[PDB]
Amino acid sequence: GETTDGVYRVMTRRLLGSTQVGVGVMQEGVFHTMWHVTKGAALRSGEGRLDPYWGDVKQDLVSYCGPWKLDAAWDGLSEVQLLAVPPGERAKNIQTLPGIFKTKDGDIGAVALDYPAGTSGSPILDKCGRVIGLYGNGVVIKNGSYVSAITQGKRE
Amino acid sequence: DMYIERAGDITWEKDAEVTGNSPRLDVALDESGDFSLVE
Numbered sequence: 001g002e003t004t005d006g007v008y009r010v011m012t013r014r015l016l017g018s019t020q021v022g023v024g025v026m027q028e029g030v031f032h033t034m035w036h037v038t039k040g041a042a043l044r045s046g047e048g049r050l051d052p053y054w055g056d057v058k059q060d061l062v063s064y065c066g067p068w069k070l071d072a073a074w075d076g077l078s079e080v081q082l083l084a085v086p087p088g089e090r091a092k093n094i095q096t097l098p099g100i101f102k103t104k105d106g107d108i109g110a111v112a113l114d115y116p117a118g119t120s121g122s123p124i125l126d127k128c129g130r131v132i133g134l135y136g137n138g139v140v141i142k143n144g145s146y147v148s149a150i151t152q153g154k155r156e
Numbered sequence: 157d158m159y160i161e162r163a164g165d166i167t168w169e170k171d172a173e174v175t176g177n178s179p180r181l182d183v184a185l186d187e188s189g190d191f192s193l194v195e
C-alpha cells in the first residue's frame with residue numbers, strides 16, 4: 001500500500017458511512033498513532049496490511065511495521081505547530097506556545113487546542129518540521145476547555 | 157476493519173494562524189493512560 005512519509009487519517013466503515021476515528025504519522029516505513037485510536041487492531045492501506053509492532057496503553061501509543069521512530073522533543077521555550085487533521089476537513093497548521101503538565105514523574109509539554117475526538121493522533125511539530133509528539137490524550141480543565149499532552153515515544 | 161488515507165506532508169507553515177494559551181497544570185496519569193487534575 002501507500003508508504004510515503006506524511007500524515008494520514010485513520011478511518012472505519014464499521015459504523016454509519018465512513019467515520020474518521022483518528023490520525024497518524026508515517027515515517028521511515030513505520031506508522032505511528034495513539035493506542036485509543038486503533039485499540040491495537042490491524043490496519044489496511046489500499047490492498048496492503050499493517051500489523052502492530054509495539055504498543056503501550058499507559059503511554060497511549062502504538063507503532064505498526066516497525067519500532068517507534070519519532071524522537072524529537074519540545075525545547076521548553078519555543079512555539080510549535082499542531083498539524084490538525086479534523087474529520088471531513090483539510091489538514092491545517094495551528095501555531096501555539098505549549099503550556100506544561102506537571103506530574104510526580106516530571107513535566108510534559110501541553111497544547112491548549114480543542115478539536116473533535118477523531119483528530120487524535122495529529123502530529124505536533126517543531127520549527128524544523130520534526131514530530132515532537134502526537135495530539136489527543138489530555139484533560140478537561142475547570143472552564144470545560146480541552147488541554148492535550150504533547151505525547152512522545154522512545155526510539156530504541 | 158480500519159484503513160488509512162494520506163492527508164498531507166508534515167511541514168512547518170510560515171505565517172500559520174497563531175492561537176491557544178499555555179496553562180501550567182498539576183496532573184496525574186493512571187495505569188489506564190487517563191490524565192486527571194490534581195488539587
Ligand SMILES: Cc1[nH][nH]c(=O)c1CCO
Pocket residue numbers: 114115116117118119120136137138146
Ligand atoms: C476525548 C478526546 N480525546 N482526544 C480529543 O481530542 C478529544 C476531544 C476533545 O476535543
